[PDB]
Structure formats: structure tokens, C-alpha cells
Design a binder for this molecule. Structure first.
Ligand SMILES: *[C@@H]1O[C@H](CO[C@@H]2O[C@@H](C)[C@@H](O)[C@@H](O)[C@@H]2O)[C@@H](O[C@@H]2O[C@H](CO)[C@@H](O[C@@H]3O[C@H](CO[C@H]4O[C@H](CO)[C@@H](O)[C@H](O)[C@@H]4O[C@@H]4O[C@H](CO)[C@@H](O)[C@H](O)[C@H]4NC(C)=O)[C@@H](O)[C@H](O[C@H]4O[C@H](CO)[C@@H](O)[C@H](O)[C@@H]4O[C@@H]4O[C@H](CO)[C@@H](O)[C@H](O)[C@H]4NC(C)=O)[C@@H]3O)[C@H](O)[C@H]2NC(C)=O)[C@H](O)[C@H]1NC(C)=O
Ligand SMILES: *[C@@H]1O[C@H](CO[C@@H]2O[C@@H](C)[C@@H](O)[C@@H](O)[C@@H]2O)[C@@H](O[C@@H]2O[C@H](CO)[C@@H](O[C@@H]3O[C@H](CO[C@H]4O[C@H](CO)[C@@H](O)[C@H](O)[C@@H]4O[C@@H]4O[C@H](CO)[C@@H](O)[C@H](O)[C@H]4NC(C)=O)[C@@H](O)[C@H](O[C@H]4O[C@H](CO)[C@@H](O)[C@H](O)[C@@H]4O[C@@H]4O[C@H](CO)[C@@H](O)[C@H](O)[C@H]4NC(C)=O)[C@@H]3O)[C@H](O)[C@H]2NC(C)=O)[C@H](O)[C@H]1NC(C)=O
Lengths: 208, 209
């Protein structure tokens, strides 16, 4: 029989009013003989009807892939509402259901410190700009880097890591060439989390 | 039938001459019909005989679970020598064999920087010391913090995360009382990795005015 997976919205989507968060429901390993699937979508247990269903698309292993997309309201997602995808296929007796929701737990505000490169690193032609984000709950978060209004490029972020006090931290690392840093250019770490004011904060860092 | 699980040594003990790395081979799901099982260790395809096998200890489901440990040579594990465990029970036609080895790939030596806590943070009870370890391959590594000889309690470490050049990096965060930091206590981040000189390096951090 098939398998079904249910993806949450992109954190930034739910956290920013201008964007548009969606819950996604994809079923894989569907037949060729009876390959027609029926979605049923439920919010806090009451069925809903605005879901957009894509028509099935075959993959290389010749199994189809069918996804349904549900727009959610920001406040509903952040207020804990359960979304439940219920998928029916006639190569299944009992239809299978999955439910997702926002990470449960009491929200805690992240502290955001920017840390300049180690003096020892100034021997290389790349330096590391560090953004420490700690003390946040739940784990759903978004961290970006930018400079003079524009998305900075060479960066990479660690997964959230459970801290000793039950909360979460992460580090994000931006690699820039030494010259830019030494010039005096200003870089900024932008964080997006439900426990921040406006769901958004920014901390800047430049050579002094 | 029965089952077999093969545990690598733990990085730090392959990496320290003075410590003792061991490959362990545990068999579970014994039969009570035939509870006798015998090992044969092959280092890179050659039978080995300095293996130790602790006796047969029965667990609550009524199965037995027995394990052989094999002390390995550091240089052998680190030189990519295959380690094969061949376990036989008359509750299974063909005997069962499993093999593991350290992860393959060109080693790359990490760089180790220590980052003092933000000034923004100095308005707190606890501050954060940061250890950046980047450029290392493969990912098997150990990071530890210490102060005046003894280890440190309050620290966590990120999983290695793949960087854009194919190497790995991570961060270790140590949280200490602002008061200890401000007295001028010195804190060390020590790293163990096979591409380091002597498998070990250390960077220290302490207050600067
Ligand atoms: C035929 O091929 C198709 C097509 O797949 C494609 O083709 C093949 C040949 C290869 O090239 C594939 O690499 C390629 O994807 C096969 O379809 C695939 O089937 C497998 C397994 O059936 C699925 O694996 C699952 O992957 C997802 C995570 O995948 C996301 O991220 C991937 C990044 O690598 C990306 O490739 C995926 O598309 C998907 O991306 C998301 O996309 C959505 C919508 O497009 C988007 O909103 C998001 O932005 C994006 N998200 C991310 C993060 O990128 C995941 O669902 C699965 O993980 C579960 O299962 C694992 C088994 O335990 C486990 O590791 C996980 O923890 C998790 O386990 C479950 O977790 C929770 C609790 O934590 C719980 O609900 C469950 O109980 C628990 N356990 C189980 C058993 O479920 C899994 O890793 C592929 O995603 C899928 N392909 C696509 C495109 O989705 C098909 O299988 C082949 N047919 C056969 C074999 O017959
Ligand atoms: C009856 O009971 C006994 C035990 O008795 C007790 O009584 C009953 C009532 C219950 O309460 C029991 O829970 C209880 O323990 C059962 O014995 C158990 O059997 C199961 C399955 O047969 C084993 O599960 C496997 O676990 C290991 C990983 O285990 C390590 O980590 C655990 C941490 O939670 C820990 O419990 C283990 O002891 C072990 O710890 C290691 O210890 C060594 C030496 O002591 C030490 O060096 C290490 O430091 C330490 N390591 C760690 C990490 O802590 C693992 O082998 C299995 O995972 C495989 O399978 C999963 C499914 O895919 C997958 O998630 C994994 O990735 C992995 O998958 C395999 O991986 C590779 C490829 O990546 C490859 O080899 C395989 O192809 C691949 N796939 C498969 C399918 O294997 C699995 O999770 C228990 O370990 C074992 N108990 C003990 C104590 O070992 C017995 O099963 C019961 N009988 C029944 C149910 O009939």
C-alpha cells in the first residue's frame, strides 16, 4: 500500500503576515491499477473544503505522487489548531490519516547575540560571522543573514539543539572574505520567532 | 531467528593513545532451543583471536543476549581496516556476519576558534563561551570544555553540519556564571580529530578587560 507524509508550513510563512503559510499533504507509492486518491482536510476536527489538489504525477519508479495543499490562517497555526489530512484510495481498506500542529509548549523569547570573527581567523582570506540565538521555545524558527539591505549569501545554520534548561539554541555562520569585514561593512542577523515582538528582530555586526 | 548488531568504538578512545578502543558485537534474539553461538572476528579478512567474549545472559523476553568485545589497534581502525563479526547459531542456516569501519573520505584538519560572550550578553547571570570548529572531515570528532584541569558541566554541542565546501563544522557553547568569567578564570575548548597533529588541540578563552 501507499505512504503519506504531512509537512508543516514554512516557519517564516506562519510568522510573517505578508506571506502565506500552507500545510502540505503528499502521498507516494500509489498504484497504476486504481490510482485515484481522495483528500479530506480537517481543522480542529471539523472538515474544510478550500484544499487545492494537484493531479497525480508519475515518478521514475512509475509510482504516482499526489499532493494536496491547504492554506492555513497564521493565527490558527500559531494558536495550536490541529490539521488532519485523511487520504482514501481503493488499494486501501481503512483510509490513512496524519495530523500536524505547531510545536506544543510555552513560548520563550530568543536572545540574539552577534559574535565577530576570532582574531586568529584574521590570518585567512575568509572570516566567520557568528549569530548565536538561544533560549527560545518552541524550535520552529527562522534565521537569515543580510548586508546593506540584501540577503547575504555564504551562510549555514545549525539545527536547534536542546539546551540544559529545556529551551533551544542554535548558531548561524556567515562566511565573508576578509576584505569586506576589514572595510567596515555592516552585516545583520535577522531572526523570526513567535516569541519576538513583531515576530522579528535584527542584530548588526561590523568591524569597529 | 536471531539478530546481530555491531558497534564501532567511540571516537575519543580510537583517538587517544592512552585510552582503549573496542569494537563490540552483540547478538540478541537467542533461541532457547539452541542457546550456543560462536564468534569469528576477521580484521580486514584475516581471522583474529584476541577477542573477549563475556558469557551468555538471558533477558526478560526469555532470549539471551551475548557480546564479544575486540580491542582494536588505534592505527588499524584509523587506517580504514574493515572489522568483520561472524556469528554462528544452529537456529540459522547460513551464519550471520556484519562488518563496519570508520567513515571513508579525505581527512581535513579542523580550525579551532574561541569566541567570547557578546557584550550584549554581559547584562546576565550566565554568559556563553563559544567554540567554533570548522573545516573538518570526516565528522567523527569530540569537543570538550574544561577549566583548571577538570571538565565543565554546562555545555552543549551542535551536530556537525555540512558546510558549502564539503567539510563539516560545529559549535560548542559553554554557559558559565558571569562571576567566574569576570574573575578572570581561563576556559579551554579541546578538540579530538584524526586529521589534527597528535589527534588533539586546545584553545583557551578568558576575559579581556
Ligand atoms: C519512487 O520514487 C518516489 C519519488 O521520490 C524521489 O524519487 C526517488 C527515486 C529518489 O530520488 C528520492 O530521493 C526522491 O524523493 C519516492 O517518493 C519518496 O518516498 C520516500 C519514502 O517513501 C519519501 O521519504 C520521506 O521523505 C520525507 C522528507 O522529504 C522532504 O524533504 C526531502 C529533502 O531531502 C525532499 O526530497 C522531499 O520532497 C520532502 O520535501 C518536502 O516537500 C514538501 C512538499 O513538496 C515541502 O513543503 C517541504 O519544503 C519539503 N521538506 C523538506 C524537509 O525538504 C519524510 O516524509 C520521510 O521521513 C519520515 O520517514 C522516515 C522513516 O522513518 C524518517 O526518517 C522520518 O523521521 C519520518 O518518519 C516519520 O516521522 C514522523 C515522526 O517524526 C511520523 O509521522 C512517522 O510515524 C515517522 N515514521 C514513518 C515510517 O513515517 C521520508 O524521509 C520521499 O519524501 C518521497 N519523495 C518525495 C519527493 O516526497 C517513492 O518512495 C518511490 N516509490 C517506491 C519506493 O515504491
Ligand atoms: C527482548 O528484549 C531484548 C532486551 O531486553 C529487554 O526486555 C524487553 C521486555 C524490552 O523491555 C527491551 O526493550 C529490553 O531491552 C531485546 O534486545 C534488543 O533488540 C532490539 C532489536 O532487536 C535492539 O534494537 C536495536 O538497537 C540498536 C541501537 O542500540 C544502541 O543504542 C540504544 C539506545 O537507545 C541501546 O538500547 C542499545 O543498548 C545500544 O547501545 C549501545 O551499546 C553499545 C555496547 O553496549 C555501546 O558501544 C554504545 O555506546 C551504545 N550505542 C548507543 C547508540 O547507545 C541498533 O542496532 C538498531 O538500530 C538499527 O535498526 C533501526 C531500524 O532501521 C534503525 O533505526 C537503525 O539505524 C539501525 O538500522 C540499521 O543500521 C545499519 C545501517 O545504518 C544496518 O546495520 C542495518 O541494515 C540497519 N537496519 C536494520 C533493520 O538493522 C535497533 O534500534 C536493542 O538494542 C536490543 N537491546 C539491547 C539492550 O541492545 C530483544 O529485541 C527483545 N526480543 C524481541 C523483541 O523479540
Amino acid at each position: 500500500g501507499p505512504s503519506v507524509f504531512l509537512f508543516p508550513p514554512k516557519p517564516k510563512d506562519t510568522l510573517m503576515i505578508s506571506r502565506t503559510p500552507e500545510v502540505t499533504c503528499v502521498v507516494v507509492d500509489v498504484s497504476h491499477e486504481d490510482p485515484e486518491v481522495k483528500f479530506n482536510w480537517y481543522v480542529d476536527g471539523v472538515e474544510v473544503h478550500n484544499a487545492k489538489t494537484k493531479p497525480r504525477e508519475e515518478q521514475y519508479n512509475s509510482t504516482y505522487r499526489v499532493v494536496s495543499v491547504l492554506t492555513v490562517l497564521h493565527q490558527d497555526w500559531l494558536n495550536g489548531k490541529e490539521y488532519k489530512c485523511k487520504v482514501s484510495n481503493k488499494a486501501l481498506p481503512a483510509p490513512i490519516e496524519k495530523t500536524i500542529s505547531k510545536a506544543k509548549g510555552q513560548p520563550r523569547e530568543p536572545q540574539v547575540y552577534t559574535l565577530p570573527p576570532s582574531r586568529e581567523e584574521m590570518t585567512k582570506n575568509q572570516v566567520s560571522l557568528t549569530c548565536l540565538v538561544k533560549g527560545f521555545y518552541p524550535s520552529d524558527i527562522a534565521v537569515e543573514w543580510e548586508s546593506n539591505g540584501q540577503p547575504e549569501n555564504n551562510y549555514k545554520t545549525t539545527p536547534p539543539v536542546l539546551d540544559s534548561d529545556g529551551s533551544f539554541f542554535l548558531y548561524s555562520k556567515l562566511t565573508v572574505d576578509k576584505s569586506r569585514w576589514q572595510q567596515g561593512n555592516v552585516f545583520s542577523c535577522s531572526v523570526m520567532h513567535e516569541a519576538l515582538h513583531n515576530h522579528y528582530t535584527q542584530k548588526s555586526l561590523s568591524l569597529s
